[PDB]
Amino acid sequence: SMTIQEIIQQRNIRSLFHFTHSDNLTSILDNGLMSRSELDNENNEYNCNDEERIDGHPDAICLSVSYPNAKMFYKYRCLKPGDWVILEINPSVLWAKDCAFYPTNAASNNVRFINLDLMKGAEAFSALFSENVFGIQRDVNLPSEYTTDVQAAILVFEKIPPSYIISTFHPNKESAEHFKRLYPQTIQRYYDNLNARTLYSQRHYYLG
DNA sequence: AAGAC
Ligand SMILES: NC(=O)c1ccc[n+]([C@@H]2C[C@H](COP(=O)(O)OP(=O)(O)OC[C@H]3O[C@@H](n4cnc5c(N)ncnc54)[C@H](O)[C@@H]3O)[C@@H](O)[C@H]2O)c1
């Protein structure tokens, strides 16, 4: 029975991602990622996206494996103007923190009723890579590090200190340079042309 | 290209 670590090694996973509005980035680089619950209790300021939290876990931080939830991400970029960024996170989070693993969006009826304890552990992690996820047939050519369903989600039930953030992606040079001046020990990356295959792209295009 | 109920 493979461990989470052995799955990461075997599939060549190198990145977890979390998209967020640039308005949140100072707070995140200072204090780490925190759940909506934990943000409320510390009276910290945040711009959140989800009004509903149908997942039912406002004490969880939501990540992606290898590629953002491009669908949900694009939606919220349309609804909220200004610069969005993408945090890249050490895959170590998956074993070092209290994670649940969901093969599709964690708010989906297909998964959200299951005993949360069954969604922890290497068995649930491996299901992100199944040949069929609730009707999505995994493409034979999809590289091993990608989830079958682009909306596959990691719910992290504790804070993620800023040291687990390995880089941040910006939509323009000036955003990256602003945050680099503030956090000179950190890696701040950017795209010069967004007419390109970028982490802001739909995945089918990115991998095309 | 626009989640989830
Ligand atoms: N953000 C993602 O990459 C992502 C990925 C996969 C799924 N989701 C789903 C969408 C939904 C949660 O929506 P989401 O948009 O993430 O809202 P949310 O309810 O978690 O809102 C929290 C917001 O606060 C932000 N935040 C975290 N730590 C801090 C901090 N220290 N200072 C300031 N802000 C902070 C975080 O980036 C996010 O925008 C769940 O149902 C998930 O299942 C989101």
Numbering used by the authors: 0 to 207
Q: What did the paper state?
A:
To confirm and characterize DarT1-catalyzed guanine ADP-ribosylation, we determined the structures of full-length E. coli C7 DarT1E152A in its pre- and post-reaction states. Co-crystallization of E. coli C7 DarT1E152A with NAD+ as well as with carba-NAD+, a non-hydrolyzable NAD+ analog, and an ssDNA 5-mer allowed insights into the substrate-bound state of DarT1, while co-crystallization with NAD+ and the ssDNA 5-mer gave a structure at 1.63 Å of the product-bound state. (I) Overlay of the crystal structures of E. coli C7 DarT1E152A in complex with NAD+ and carba-NAD+:DNA to represent the pre-reaction, i.e., NAD+:DNA-bound state. The distal-ribose C1 linkage to the base and the potential proton transfer from the guanine N2 onto D54 and R52 over the water molecule w88 involved in the mechanism is indicated with black arrows. The interplay of key residues in the active site for catalyzing the reaction is enabled by their proximity, allowing coordination of the guanosine, the NAM moiety, and the distal ribose, which promote NAD+ polarization, NAM-ribose bond cleavage, and generation of an oxocarbenium ion intermediate. Of particular note is that comparison of DarT1 in the carba-NAD+:DNA-bound state with the ADPr-DNA-bound state revealed that the side-chain flexibility of R51 in DarT2 could not be observed in DarT1. The corresponding arginine residue in DarT1 (R52) hydrogen bonds in all captured states to the β-phosphate and is furthermore ideally hydrogen-bonded by D54, indicating their interplay for catalysis.
